[PDB]
């Protein structure tokens, strides 16, 4: 079972709503999943790189924060 499907249609609507979206194509869900799947693969490829360099087997919040700042999308409240 590909977990990705676990990103439910009803979650994807809730996000969109927050974005001021009122009506939505049904096709979107499959595009929102691959978009989402890209975004993570990039960030976790980075997060796991820092981790691999620190020699650990545990990915930290710092491993994510450094990956997100490399990716342009800097994040506050998990240790800047």
């Amino acid at each position: 079972r590909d977990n990705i499907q676990g990103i439910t249609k009803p979650a994807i609507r809730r996000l969109a709503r927050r974005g001021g979206v009122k009506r939505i194509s049904g096709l979107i869900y499959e595009e929102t999943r691959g978009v989402l799947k890209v975004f993570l693969e990039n960030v976790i490829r980075d997060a796991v790189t820092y981790t691999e360099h620190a020699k650990r087997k545990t990915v930290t919040a710092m491993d994510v924060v450094y990956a997100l700042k490399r990716q342009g999308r800097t994040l506050y409240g998990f240790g800047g």
Binding site: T8, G19, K22, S25, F39, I44, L75
Partner: protein, 100 residues
């Protein structure tokens, strides 16, 4: 003897007001977590994840895609529309500079 139903749109507009009012995480946390490990494995197996690290992943995913919807809605409205679509997404992402 009235069955008073809402018109196709009005619970979309409430649902907006609501979730823009709130800050809580809108993907269900367990599915996200497992997915995150299913992505990770493709680089390194047998990986452990701080709880807060996986929150730091989600917090980013949602606020990314929240953003991506905002812009994707402005792509729809541009096209004289109100339904968002795959071609609204992909334009935002192109103009954002995410794919060739």
């Amino acid at each position: 003897k009235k069955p008073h139903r809402y018109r196709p749109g009005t619970v979309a507009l409430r649902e907006i007001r609501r979730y823009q009012k709130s800050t809580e995480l809108l993907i269900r946390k367990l599915p996200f977590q497992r997915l995150v490990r299913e992505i990770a494995q493709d680089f390194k197996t047998d990986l452990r994840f701080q709880s807060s690290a996986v929150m730091a992943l989600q917090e980013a995913c949602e606020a990314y895609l929240v953003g991506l919807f905002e812009d994707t809605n402005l792509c729809a409205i541009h096209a004289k529309r109100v339904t968002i679509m795959p071609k609204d997404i992909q334009l935002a992402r192109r103009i954002r500079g995410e794919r060739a």
